Amino acid sequence: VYSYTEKKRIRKDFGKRPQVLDVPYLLSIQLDSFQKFIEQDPEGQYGLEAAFRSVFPIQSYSGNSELQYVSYRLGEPVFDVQECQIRGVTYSAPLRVKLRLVIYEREAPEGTVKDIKEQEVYMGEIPLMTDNGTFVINGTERVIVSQLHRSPGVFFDSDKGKTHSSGKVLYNARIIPYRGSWLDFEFDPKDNLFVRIDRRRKLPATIILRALNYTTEQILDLFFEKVIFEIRDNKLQMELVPERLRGETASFDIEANGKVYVEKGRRITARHIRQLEKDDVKLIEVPVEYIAGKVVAKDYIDESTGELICAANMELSLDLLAKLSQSGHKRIETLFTNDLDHGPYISETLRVDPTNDRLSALVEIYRMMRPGEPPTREAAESLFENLFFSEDRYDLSAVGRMKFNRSLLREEIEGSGILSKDDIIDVMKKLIDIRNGKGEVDDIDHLGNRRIRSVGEMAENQFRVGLVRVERAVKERLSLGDLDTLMPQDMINAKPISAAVKEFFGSSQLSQFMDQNNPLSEITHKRRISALGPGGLTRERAGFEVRDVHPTHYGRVCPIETPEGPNIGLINSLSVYAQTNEYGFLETPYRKVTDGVVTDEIHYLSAIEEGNYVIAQANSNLDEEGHFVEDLVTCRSKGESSLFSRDQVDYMDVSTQQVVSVGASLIPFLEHDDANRALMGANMQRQAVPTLRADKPLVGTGMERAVAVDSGVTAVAKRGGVVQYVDASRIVIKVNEDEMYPGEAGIDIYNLTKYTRSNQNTCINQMPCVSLGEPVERGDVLADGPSTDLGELALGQNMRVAFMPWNGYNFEDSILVSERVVQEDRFTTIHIQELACVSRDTKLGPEEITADIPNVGEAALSKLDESGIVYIGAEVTGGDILVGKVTPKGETQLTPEEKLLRAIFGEKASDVKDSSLRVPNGVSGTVIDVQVFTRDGVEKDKRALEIEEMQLKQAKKDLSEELQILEAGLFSRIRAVLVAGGVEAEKLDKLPRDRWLELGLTDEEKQNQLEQLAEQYDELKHEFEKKLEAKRRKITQGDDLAPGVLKIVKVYLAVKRRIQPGDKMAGRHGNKGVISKINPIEDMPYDENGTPVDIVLNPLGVPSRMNIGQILETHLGMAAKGIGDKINAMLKQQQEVAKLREFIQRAYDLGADVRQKVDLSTFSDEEVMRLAENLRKGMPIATPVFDGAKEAEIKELLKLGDLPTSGQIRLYDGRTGEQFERPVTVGYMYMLKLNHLVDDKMHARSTGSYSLVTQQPLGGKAQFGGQRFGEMEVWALEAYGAAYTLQEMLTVKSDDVNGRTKMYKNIVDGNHQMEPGMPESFNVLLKEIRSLGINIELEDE
Amino acid sequence: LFVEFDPEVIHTTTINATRGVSHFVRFGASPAIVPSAVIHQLSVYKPKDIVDPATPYPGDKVIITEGAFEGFQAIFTEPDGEARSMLLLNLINKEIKHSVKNTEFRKL
Amino acid sequence: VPLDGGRFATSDLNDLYRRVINRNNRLKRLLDLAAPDIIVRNEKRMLQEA
DNA sequence: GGGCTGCGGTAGCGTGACGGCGAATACCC
DNA sequence: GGGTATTCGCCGTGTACCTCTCGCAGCCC
RNA sequence: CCGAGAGGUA
Secondary structure (H helix, E strand, C coil): CCCCCCCCCCCEECCCCCCCCCCCCCCHHHHHHHHHHCCCCHHHCCCHHHHHHHHCCEECCCCCCEEEEEEEEECCCCCCHHHHHHHCCCCEEEEEEEEEEEECCCCCCCCCCCEEEEEEEEEEEEECCCCCCCCCCCCCCEEECEECEECCEEEEECCCCCCCCCCCCCCEEEEECCECCCEEEECCCCCCCEEECCCCCCEECCHHHHHCCCCHHHHHHHHCCEEEEECCCCCCCEECCHHHHCCCECCCCEEECCEEEECCCCECCHHHHHHHHHHCCCEECCCHHHHHCCEECCCEEECCCCEEEECCCEECCHHHHHHHHHHCCCEEEEECCECCCECCHHHHHHHHCCCCCHHHHHHHHHHHHCCCCCCCHHHHHHHHHHHCCCCCCCECCHHHHHHHHHCCCCCCCCCCCCCCHHHHHHHHHHHHHHHHCCCCCCCCCCHHHEECCCHHHHHHHHHHHHHHHHHHHHHHHHCCCCCCCCCCCCCCCCHHHHHHHHHHHHCCCCEEECCCCCHHHHHHHHCEEECCCCCCCCCCCCCCCCCCCCHHHCCCECCCCCCCCCCCCCCCEECCCCEECCCCCEEEEEEECCCCCCCCCEEEECHHHHCCCCEECCCCCECCCCCECCCEEEEECCCCEEEEECCCCCEEECCCCCCCCCCCCCCCCHHHECHHHHHHHHHHHCCECCECCCECCCEECCCHHHHHHHCCCCCECCCCEEEEEECCCEEEEEECCCCCCCCCCCEEEEECCCCEECCCCEEECCEECCCCCCEECCCCECEECCCEECCEECCCEEEEEEECCCCCCCCCCCEEECHHHHHCCCCCEEECCEEEEEEECCCCCCCECCCCCCCCCHHHHCCECCCCEECCCCCCCCCCEEECCEECCCCCCCCHHHHHHHHHCCCCCCCCEECCEECCCCCCCCCCEEEEEECCCCCCCHHHHHHHHHHHHHHHHHHHHHHHHHHHHHHHHHHHHCCCCCCCCCCCCCCCCCCCCCCCCCCCHHHHHHHHHHHHHHHHHHHHHHHHHHHHHHHHCCCCCCCCEEEEEEEECCEEECCCCCCEEECCCCCEEEEEEECCCCCCCEECCCCECCEEECHHHCCCCCECHHHHHHHHHHHHHHHHHHHHHHHHCCCCHHHHHHHHHHHHHCCCCCCCCCCHHHCCCCHHHHHHHHHCCCCCEECCCCCCCCHHHHHHHHHHCCCCCCCEECEECCCCCCECCCCEEEEEEEEEEECCCHHHHCCCCCCCCECCCCCCECCCCCCCCCCCCCHHHHHHHHHCCCHHHHHHHHHHCCCCHHHHHHHHHHHHCCCCCCCCCCCHHHHHHHHHHHCCCCCCCCCCC | CCCCCCCCCCCHHHHHCCCCCCCCCCCCCCCCCCCHHHHHHCCCCCCCCCCCCCCCCCCCEEEECCHHHCCCCEEECCCCCCCCEEEEECCCCCCEEEEECCCCEEEC | CECCCCCECCCHHHHHHHHHHHHHHHHHHHHHHCCCHHHHHHHHHHHHHC
16 A cells, blocks of 8 residues: 555565564754754753752852742744845844742741742743754754763773883772863873872872771771681781682691691692682681781780780781780781782872871872872862762763773672762772682773763753853852842843854854755765764874774674775764664664564664674564574574574564665665775765756665655655645645544645755755645655655666776776767756845945946946846856945045045045956856845935835735635635535525625534634634734845945855766766766767667776666666666557556566565556656666565566666767677666866966965966965975976065066066076075074175 | 961962962962061052053153154143043144143153 | 055064063052052063063 | 943863974982 | 872874865943 | 865765
């Protein structure tokens, strides 16, 4: 079953795997992030409510007054999006917050406030989001790219080799919080542990333990296990657990019960440990020499003296044993410090510590963190008890607490935002565990360590910054303000909030300009995962690993759509099915596998959960039962592609499209190309200009529908129904009944967006693709936008390609093109330049925009009107004048005596210079639109009033058409009511249409509905009044401008660039080409049926550049146009529908198992002829990404046409008329026109303008500049003998000013000779060095 | 500006974060200590004049910054008080005089 | 030189020279007015660093 | 209105490069 | 008294071109 | 008509 417009042209679908999950809405990241940001959200998570409930209620420094919060609300935007892009203001909504101020008295902690007040405060504007996922910031249309930063939480990093220059590894441990101070623990090659905070100086790591009110004994109790020595009858017998005997050598006799268990000299096996644990051997007698290296655990004082025998963490000897033996301390506690398993890291770190107690520890930490200013107890205690422990200046997110618990193998996934004592202790213990061997370090590129910020999170953080600045301002005003005369706006200021959020949306590394020349480019620019930005890594520093594809990218981040250049792998694009987890991680769908029958249910997995289970492959051979037909199948366990059992798996990939993105799920035959040429194909397919006639890719992948429908450049119907009226500019739909609301009668009016400028100076244009009076369904497209065809996606056009050398004109990668291409205007595209002219208020009076222009005549004024502004439709070329602007010239600077002279005698200057807005060089076109903007204190000239009256009549006419055709639909519902319930037919057509209600109808719900629509009609009357008047206010007013400009005139040209030797066309597979020769039709290689070929590529681009998929696209497109030619034959020698539907069903059956067939016996005997009208230009074929069409199905489809199964046709030459040997490949390749056009790159300069600080030619094309004869070219001329070429190259042609003036005079004298001289930038070098304290000169002649 | 406090009572960070204060004078790590003799000898001070950098005294020579006399050196004869001034303006033939406000001329 | 508007695209060198000249003029006025030791020390220090 | 001036605040922000090299100094005589 | 040996802070990190936006806020004189 | 930031081609 299909739509009514899916039956327009249904694509032949190859594809064998039955899909379970349909492709989701592709722009869900942007829209769901912003909808999470702005939402009237109960319980305060996530959104603006979280930021307000973090910052509110505001109280002062016990000032007996406390501002509290109620709610917020955003008003409607004052500007709709079209007039917003034209006018240049933001598209934003006002933020109206209702705050409530209550003010206590002196000594009223629980006492009631003497006064309340609750007003609605306005705190700036935040920019809303257009429903396509874009912003409009200042006229321009900008996109925030989703970031990819290090997840908040603990991480254990190796840095195995670069340290120490000795091969010894270190192991650091970084605690990364969401907001606050960083924290790092690390070792050093003396095996001492160290801490550093915010990459500052290095302290020994236990001093922060002393900051946490821990004694030496408590630290030793935490980081070590006790080893007990007891004074007994002789030689201080010892508790010895046999587990501590792991991997040691007996330097003393190991015995008990008169039995030598382990002899001295031999190592202790696990057999020996088992025999001791079996014989239950605990107390053993040691020599006195064994404690001569061990370390005492805790402090022991002598009870006679009360003085300390030995401090904690002191190595013992025989004299200390003689002291503690005669004291009475029979018990001695020691530390198991062996170098294999339990190292003495904490003890040695305590020996490095220059401190003893908590106060000196806090002093040392304060001298680390904030040096210079004097250490005092109160400030240091406030510092360290605010560094990690306050809710204000330190906060892990809930994401941070979840990662920080999962990495510590904690149990809960919820907790506090601050840290605690046990947190730091467990981090140091886990670090020591990694040092000792248990547990391993976490790699950084693992996508479970790697979180996505989006629009909502970053804009929420900037709004939080604005809020904390305004609460500091409010607490300043609250402790100083007077009561009771201030309402909550003398305290508040809307300036910091709006300043912060507009600095983020305007000037950020992520609020970037939208790459808008394609539907695909929009939809793959919004779905972009930047690794750059604040908190991210830069381009010119790092690295290799963050540029490299990691095994967790399967199904989360696209592996092949990434830009070649300086940032490969940093601006990675996001996969098709990859959603975002609620913690911000990348979740990807998998099919839940309970057992041998694969279940039909989907289940989302993050990156860390992927390694635990075992996930099947997408194209695993199963047959109608869920049963994998083998007992062994390719799966992956922990990033390890290996073959596992039939029932050990847990999950299966959803579809075979899920590994890639929409930039390169539209490349057919992707499974046959190398990854390099797939990357080049995706990055070029982002760059194709929208041609003039969209032309339905014959070899598609089926994802064209999702890219067309999801990226909002087509007009999808909100409510389905019947076409009432299609014009080229609006489409008016009458709505079906079951999708219709009872009140508000309703017809859907879709105003199309006609020829206007895109962000890359291409033409965006929507065209009505439905007829008059046609049934359309909800969710169906109504207008094909740029690069779309009947709701599909059509970037380039599909042409008859042939792979052969043709007399050298396609040598390296060049492309030789027929004249049939340039005659049909099938790559002829439309470009649009916006040229502005501004009238600034300057000295000697401001400037006129009059047509009275000096030194020109009617040669320029023949295309200007009474006002001086060009007519709409003037076919201008380069060098003309579009807006005549004149300036107060004369620049005399007359004396104050002459100033008094002209002030008394009264003579003005009245001289003038042309400064008109002229057409740039080379361009032609057509003025299609002139906008005039005027500051409100400026009077209007006559064309401004003409455009003002034009826009006013257009506004009144548009609102009148709205009210009239909505009134026609309202009266049609009234007519639908008035059929039954007292029918009075000839009583209806005599009275006017306004009162159809007063005919006979009883006291039922129908007259109730008539009164509903009548009050709707009176609502429409008052709304027509207020909207016409508000629109008159909008049109009549002048707009705000930059301070200092009077009026702006913006002209929109529309150049139509066709194609020429020099442009860049390319396929979808990575086969770039500069179109070399635009041949005539006759010289083309024609086949024996007479048909010329269109484009002749090069076969040598296939074995080197291993893109074999373009050949399969060529053969399959040849089969497609063979079917199209057969349908054109069966329809031109026109037949009945029976043979046509037989051939169409043969076309849609095709052998092996597909997901398609068609229910072709149901298409009303007119939907077959309409489908054959849409198939006569070649039958479209869905070859999906990895589940595509095999070779034999291509051969079988070529056998359905009458084409040869070889794929290769014999061709003649147009020149010699004789057959080429060895028949060649012809077919249809879908080739794109990229927008690197040669008449934009071409530039030349003899002598234009010269730069000011150094008399050198300028740089660029738009500035009429010269080429940088760079450094390596000077080295190349030195590598020849070319001295005089270099001498005129860097002195006369560039820098020496008198040299080039004398040179130009010599050339017009016909003398070829230079006066060399000295270059001026060398004199600038001498003035800069001499402007230091350095004397530099030039010596003797 | 000079302050007298103790770091235990109100801390130097708090003094440094005061609304309107740039920084302590340090010379190095710690903020500077001025001795008690400097505070004592800056109790009674400011003896000489009403010295006034860049404001004109009468009986001097100035220049004109705006108007139809811009670029004319002038002598103070007698300003009217503390509100405006009166100037002996030069010309290339004959000097004139004028009573003008203090924005349209500045001192040499 | 100005960019296209009402404001000058300023250069960094003129900021540096303006900072040096302002500090040197303040230091001349303080050496004239006989400021105490630590004040003219700070003044010569800021001049050195500028 | 504008000349100036460098964090905005009664603190703290910084945190994802890496190698080489040569001087300055720490530790141990 | 100096002889290593670690730390520190300075250097450096492709070329050519094309496009786009944005380029002082505050302020108390 | 100089700097910064973002993107792209080779």
